[PDB]
């Protein structure tokens, strides 16, 4: 059995989780003859945007889907990324991702 669960004038591993979560996308791309690589800055930005200290890693999956899966699918449909190519994800500059 397992269970889970002032007024005023007072003062005086996440990168591993991101890798695991993007493992599914990387595998699906591999089935499509594609190799996904994420830079350290990209993983840091993904963790910053999608990791909620209050709610843990709950909003991380949707964040990855928003930032990578949607853009990657759009680019695949545009044919700008073809089978056998290595898809590298980088971050520039609030910031924004970019795919090579």
């Amino acid at each position: 059995l397992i269970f889970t669960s002032g007024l005023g004038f007072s003062k005086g591993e996440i990168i591993r989780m991101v890798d695991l979560m993007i493992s599914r996308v990387a595998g699906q791309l591999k089935s499509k003859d594609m190799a996904l690589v994420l830079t350290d800055a990209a993983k840091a930005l993904l963790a910053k945007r999608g990791f909620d200290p209050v709610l843990g890693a709950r909003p991380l999956r949707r964040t990855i889907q928003r930032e990578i899966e949607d853009q990657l699918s759009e680019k695949i449909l545009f044919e700008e990324v073809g089978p056998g190519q290595v898809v590298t994800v980088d971050v520039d500059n609030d910031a924004v991702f970019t795919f090579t």
Binding site: G6, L7, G8, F9
Partner: protein, 187 residues
């Protein structure tokens, strides 16, 4: 006669995070304002606290109590002038969060240097102390208004040397408020 409904209008305003500084600024009103500010901050620190000002001024230490409480709390403060803001109230009006100090079109602001009402008797060795304290309070008001209006203490001192009255627009050009409320009527 203030008619209740269901609560009084003042309770309804307070629920919406509105504080009413509608009396003379003294110890009683200062304590009431401080208690309300602390309660509102505890209930929801993020949300802003509005503060309506229709007062003819008052004491200096009570002004500073209210001022410190307003600046201290986590919540942003938004000051409205309504009908008048004279002497202490003016400082409080200028003490709202920048960009969130507004006044009604026919409001009136009135800034002047601190004045002693009555006579303080005693030996010269005590009147020297009282004069030094009065100068300190005056300089403190100069510095607060200079901080919150973006004007040098010298300019503010020269301007407040004698009672200076400002309309809402003149107050805006003076840095005491940020906006003059346009009327909201649908016709």
């Amino acid at each position: 006669i203030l008619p209740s409904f269901i609560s009084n209008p003042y309770n309804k305003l307070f629920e919406e995070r509105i504080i009413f500084l509608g009396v003379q600024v003294d110890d009683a009103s200062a304590n009431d304002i401080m208690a309300q500010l602390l309660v509102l901050e505890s209930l929801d620190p993020d949300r802003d606290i509005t503060m309506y000002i229709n007062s003819p001024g008052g004491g200096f230490t009570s002004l500073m109590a209210i001022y410190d409480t307003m600046q201290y709390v986590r919540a942003d403060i938004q000051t409205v002038c309504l009908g008048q803001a004279a002497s202490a109230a003016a400082v409080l009006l200028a003490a709202g969060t920048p960009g969130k100090r507004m006044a009604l079109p026919n409001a009136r602001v009135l800034i002047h240097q601190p004045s002693l009402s009555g006579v303080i008797q005693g030996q010269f060795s005590d009147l020297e102390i009282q004069a030094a304290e009065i100068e300190r309070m005056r300089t403190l008001m100069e510095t607060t208004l200079a901080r919150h209006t973006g004007k040098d203490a010298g300019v503010i001192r020269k301007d407040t040397d004698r009672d200076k009255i400002l309309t809402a627009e003149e107050a805006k050009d003076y840095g005491i408020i940020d906006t003059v409320l346009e009327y909201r009527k649908l016709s």
